[PDB]
């Protein structure tokens, strides 16, 4: 049973993503099967930033691909985590991939941010439910790898 914190600037789709996962701040629970093994995830959509950051088994940092300011905020959030948790899995998410015409952050900028962070990167669309199940399965897989590389 794993606690997952959603972090990111206002308006990026944290609540959208969480409500889709929950099948529905606020909290969501849900058991899912990942590589043949059941896992429960508790998703905290609660973004006292220090307290929030002190608390997860994994961190999902969300920005909107339509909002370069939210992508900058993602880098700021990562620096903060580095100070707050001085091992934890982090997934970077570029949401709103359906809004092709208003895109402000390229896929390659997202990928580059992943290299700097040394973390996994995925783009999502809460509007289309695209990559939402993959995001949360990835969370589970990344937590397991870190339980086991020990």
Ligand X SMILES: Nc1nc2c(ncn2[C@@H]2O[C@H](COP(=O)(O)OP(=O)(O)O)[C@@H](O)[C@H]2O)c(=O)[nH]1
Could you tell me which residues are annotated as the binding site for GTP?
Answer: 8-15, 95-98
The bridge status of strand 2-7 relative to strand 58-64 is parallel
**126 belongs to the binding site for ligand X (CB under 6 A):** yes
Rounded Cα distance, 64 and 129, in Å: 15
**Is 98 a binder of ligand X (CB under 6 A)?**
yes
Burial of 2 (0-12, 13-18, 19+ CB in 10 A): middle
Q: Which is nearer to Mg ion, 30 or 146 (CB)?
A: 30
Instruction: Classify strands 58-64 and 37-45 as parallel, antiparallel or unpaired.
Output: unpaired
Q: Which of 118, 141, 149 is nearest to 57 (CA)?
A: 141
Q: How far is the CB of 110 from ligand X (least distance, A)?
A: 14
Nearer to Mg ion, 10 or 36 (CB): 10
Q: How far are the Cα atoms of 94, 106, 109 from residue 73, in angstroms, in the given order?
A: 12, 16, 14
Residue 143 binding target from Mg ion, ligand X, none, CB below 5 to 8 Å by type: none
Q: Site residues for Mg ion, window 5-44 (CB under 5 A)?
A: 14-15
Residues 6+ apart with CB under 8 A from 45: 6, 14, 15, 18, 25, 26, 27, 28
Answer yes or no whether residue 96 interacts with ligand X by CB under 6 A: yes
Query: Candidates 28-36, 48-56, 95-103, 133-141 — which segment interacts with ligand X by CB under 6 A?
Result: 95-103
By CB under 5 A, how many residues form the interface with Mg ion? Answer: 2
* 78 binds ligand X per the rule CB under 6 A: no
Interacting residues toward Mg ion by CB under 5 A: 14-15
Interacting residues toward ligand X by CB under 6 A: 8, 10-16, 95-96, 98-99, 125-127
């Amino acid at each position: 049973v794993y606690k997952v914190l959603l972090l990111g600037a206002p308006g990026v789709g944290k609540s959208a993503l969480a409500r889709i996962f929950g099948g529905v701040g606020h909290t969501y629970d849900r058991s899912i099967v990942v590589d043949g093994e059941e896992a429960s995830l508790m998703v905290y959509d609660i973004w006292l930033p220090g307290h929030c950051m002190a608390m997860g088994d994994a961190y999902v940092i969300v920005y909107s691909v339509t909002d370069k300011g939210s992508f900058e905020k993602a880098s700021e959030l990562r620096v903060q985590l580095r100070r707050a948790r001085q091992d934890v899995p982090i997934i970077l998410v570029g949401n709103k991939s359906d809004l092709v015409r208003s895109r402000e952050v390229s896929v390659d900028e997202g990928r580059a941010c992943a290299v700097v962070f040394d973390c996994k990167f995925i783009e999502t669309s809460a509007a289309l439910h695209h990559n939402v199940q993959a995001l949360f399965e990835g969370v589970v897989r990344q937590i397991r790898l870190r339980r086991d590389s020990k």
